[PDB]
From Swiss-Prot, chain D:
Part of the 50S ribosomal subunit. Cross-links to the 23S rRNA. Cross-links to the A and P site tRNAs. This is Large ribosomal subunit protein bL27. PROSITE patterns: RIBOSOMAL_L27. It comes from Escherichia coli (strain K12). Signal peptide: none annotated. Belongs to the bacterial ribosomal protein bL27 family. The keyword tRNA-binding applies. GO terms for biological process: assembly of large subunit precursor of preribosome; cytoplasmic translation; cytosolic ribosome assembly; positive regulation of ribosome biogenesis; regulation of cell growth; ribosomal large subunit assembly. GO terms for cellular component: cytoplasm; cytosolic large ribosomal subunit. GO terms for molecular function: ribosome binding; rRNA binding; structural constituent of ribosome; tRNA binding.
Length: 52, 96, 64, 76
RNA sequence: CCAUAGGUUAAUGAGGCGAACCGGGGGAACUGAAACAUCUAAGUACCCCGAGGAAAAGAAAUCAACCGAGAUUCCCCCAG
RNA sequence: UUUUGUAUAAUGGGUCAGCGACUUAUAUUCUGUAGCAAGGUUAACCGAAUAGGGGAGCCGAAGGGAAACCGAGUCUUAACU
RNA sequence: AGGACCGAACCGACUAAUGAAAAAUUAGCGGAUGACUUGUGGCUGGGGGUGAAAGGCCAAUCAAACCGGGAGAUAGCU
RNA sequence: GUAACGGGGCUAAACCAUGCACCGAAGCUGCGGCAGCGACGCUUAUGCGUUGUUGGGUAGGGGAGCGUUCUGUAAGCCUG
RNA sequence: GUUUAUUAAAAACACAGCACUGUGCAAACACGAAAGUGGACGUAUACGGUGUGACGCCUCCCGGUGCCGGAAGGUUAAUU
RNA sequence: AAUCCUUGUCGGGUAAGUUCCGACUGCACGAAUGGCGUAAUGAUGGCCAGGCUGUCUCCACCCGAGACUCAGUGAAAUUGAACUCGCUGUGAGAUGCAGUGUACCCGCGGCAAGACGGAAAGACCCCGUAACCUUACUAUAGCUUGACACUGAACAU
RNA sequence: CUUUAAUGUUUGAUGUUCUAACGUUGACCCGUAAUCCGGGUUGCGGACAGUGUCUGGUGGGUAGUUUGACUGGGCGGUCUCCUCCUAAAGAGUAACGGAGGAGCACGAAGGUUGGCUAAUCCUGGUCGGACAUCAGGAGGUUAGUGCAAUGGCAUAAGCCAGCUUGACUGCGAGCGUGACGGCGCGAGCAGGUGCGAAAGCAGGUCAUAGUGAUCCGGUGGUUCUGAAUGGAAGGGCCAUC
């Protein structure tokens, strides 16, 4: 289980976040995907942040 | 709830919710129970007197349950829509 | 003496209109990111207690 | 020994057979590959699980050049 | 050195016994938890001191909830 | 008696007489039965008193929701075919 | 002179065969002026004593005495 | 201790084939009796004509009773 | 010499002797919630503990675990 | 050797010696949990010899005490009930079942093959979620560290 | 701000001395006929020592316990999940039966649109060879599948490329499978997305392993709750560790 977990946070400014896994050795760059925010009820860009 | 040594059904399942202290001082009053009082006016106090709700009861709704025939003046009580309608039909008054 | 309730049982179960018992599902507490969302969603709502273990629950909770 | 292991049995196989009336949604076959293929009014799930998409009678049939088994639903 | 300690008399009271109950000072373990250590058993058993016909407590630096109650003790509820 | 299984060479009994083991209390559920019935029932206590009073309370006639809350609906969800 | 020697009492208990005896008998056996033996009284108390040490002995009881209590401990065993 | 037909014994009283007799069980039938459970129909004292059928039983479940001591009924009734 | 009173008397225990080690006296140590007592009315040629066991000839490793000494740095409690 | 292989091999002792004594690949001696010697001592272990013998070849007889008989007294363990034989089978080792054989009823003295004889709810063995006896876990008396308290005054660095 | 000197005052510690706490199991005196005890005088020691409370260490000295099960007892091996066989042509089915794997990987190795078709061998061809790359053919999946085995796969599920985030949020008729806890498949509906001209497809991956209940907490959001009231703390609900 080398592949650590992270949370994609909503750029909408809501609390909402998705959580997921990524391999931090092979992929140093941050994960940015366009995911559905269900509070805004729109598809927003979600940027990787630390799970904590 | 001993199942051999298997983790019993209660211990398996997660706990939930919390108790409301405000729920213990609320009450529900049938339409049928509005006739049980005296004077044709329904306060909390009146209800208590008539032994319908109980002494530690700060709040009380009137629910559409049973039926009301005599006209009644419900005062300082919550009433549901249906209940209210019933009261109106009966010839009653409602006030906050 | 009065029967004592199993307090844990009380915490975990609530009696319903037809004498059933609702309860929160297991598996939706931690170790979530790996669980598929659909499964999680399914888990969320309260669930009735099954016919098999009903009796045990009843025993636990005499005052309901 | 090195040999005690085995897996839990998966209860695959044909659930409803030829002519059985089914409700839409009902699973006709659990299977590993597409041993049976999806025919008319039958869907194939992500685990190749064939299931009725409509209420009717299950209808197994061989079809096509490869001579493949195809489960359909006859209308009802 | 004065004093005090000490010493000899005198008067008054105490001492010891006793079933349970009562207040205080100490205080287990078996057992249960299907093991076990937190926990339980239980402030129980037991030991010790003291008292009384009863004891203890008792006259709000108490509750309550914006209404009010009005020292302590005991019983039924509240409530498993 | 215990056992898959006992004439068993498996257990127990020398015989007789006497005694010797599913109780009781309080809670809770289900069955029967009697009472009254959208009602039913009182507890302590008072009452020399199994009466009568005492309805403090308890159970029921409404549920849904974690809860606020709503209420024959309600929770879910932005909203439910 | 001597934890010297042979040997009765006295103290013991190596071999033997055999209820009068809950450890004895008879026949032999060891020590016998000593780290000896014995009378009377005293002291040490239970996780405590005492032990030239065997887990020995502590009232015919000892890897934790006896008596009473917790106590109808608990017993998925008979 | 014969001791590898249960024994006697058997040249069939052995084996094969075909046949017809008989024996043979707590099976089936016959006659008599009791009880359970269903059907219908009586017309009732809530069971009766009947009419099918059932009735081995450990753990265990359900149903119905006998007897013992004591209280009432009983200052009754039986009893030198 | 001692020992398993009551299946083991021995090669076991003890022993004089040897060595290590502690202890400066209100000694170490031991029994005591403590007071105190033993050690000892003794004082290092003494007392305690440990091992070895008359007499004779004798009797590499300090890495590990202990003990003794060191305290420069690292780490480190209550407290603040 | 208070050494598996092992009755090692060689020598001595014996007609013959897995033991004993003397010597020569330490499974796995070894120096104060002492090594190697050692006069004396030992109800100490092992081995050999002389003497002695009923220990034995191989038992015989005799003397007493019991055993046996008579009179008196008078136990005990055990015990489902017994009209309580052999064999071969069966049923997992038969007085009791099958087939068969044998056997008139009842004592007394003897013997111990069986009654899985009597005795003690196996001591071995296993099981079950007691007791005593390390660098297991958790505590803790004791010993030890510092901080505050009982605890004060000066002077310097 | 980097860095110090001056005057004024303030804690921390470090020894030297003191004498008055405290010690004295030094001496003498008295209570006293008294090696106890106390008081007195005095010497020595002296703010140490020693006691209490807190605190770290050490602590089988002592105590309370634990020390798994399966097992043709211990030792060895095993314990969850996936594939095959045993398994008797539905499902299921045991053994310390026979054989192998898993405790992940991947922001592309997922979505979608468009395109493509393998191993091996033969013949020819610079270095170049049994085995690189390139031609012509045979072959027909004998290959490939991120990793075991099975069942699948050409409409490819195999191989390339373009654009992308459906590896969406709320739900879910109806089924399957479990004693239950649970696990699985799912058309369709709402919102909002991507690929496509469009029909359509997309709620992860060819499928079947890659996993852990509850409790206790942690983080973010959420006025649901908030013990006189307003807040807050704590609790709940959603997401997550």
């Amino acid at each position: 289980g080398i592949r650590e977990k992270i949370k994609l946070v909503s750029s909408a400014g809501t609390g909402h976040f998705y959580t997921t896994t990524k391999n931090k050795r092979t992929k140093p760059e941050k994960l940015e995907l366009k995911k559905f925010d269900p509070v805004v009820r729109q598809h927003v860009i979600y940027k990787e942040a630390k799970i904590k | 709830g001993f199942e051999g040594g298997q983790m019993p059904l209660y211990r398996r399942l997660p706990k939930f919710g919390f108790t409301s202290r405000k729920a213990a001082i609320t009450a529900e009053i049938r339409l049928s129970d509005l006739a049980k009082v005296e004077g044709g006016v329904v306060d909390l106090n009146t209800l208590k007197a008539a032994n319908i709700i109980g002494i530690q009861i700060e709040f009380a709704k009137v629910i559409l349950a049973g039926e009301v025939t005599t006209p009644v003046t419900v005062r300082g009580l919550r009433v549901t829509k249906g209940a209210r309608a019933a009261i109106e039909a009966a010839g009653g008054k409602i006030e906050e | 003496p009065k029967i004592k309730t199993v307090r844990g049982a009380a915490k975990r179960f609530k009696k319903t209109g037809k004498g059933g018992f609702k309860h929160k599902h297991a598996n939706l507490r931690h170790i979530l990111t790996k669980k598929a969302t659909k499964r999680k969603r399914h888990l969320r709502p309260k669930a009735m207690v099954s016919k098999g273990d009903l009796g045990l629950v009843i025993a636990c909770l005499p005052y309901a | 020994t090195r040999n005690g292991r085995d897996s839990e049995a998966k209860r695959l196989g044909v659930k409803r057979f030829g002519g059985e009336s089914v409700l839409a949604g009902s699973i006709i076959v659990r299977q590993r590959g597409t041993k049976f293929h999806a025919g008319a009014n039958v869907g194939c799930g992500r685990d190749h699980t064939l299931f009725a998409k409509a209420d009717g009678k299950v209808k197994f049939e061989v079809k096509g050049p490869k001579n493949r088994k195809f489960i359909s639903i006859e209308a009802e």
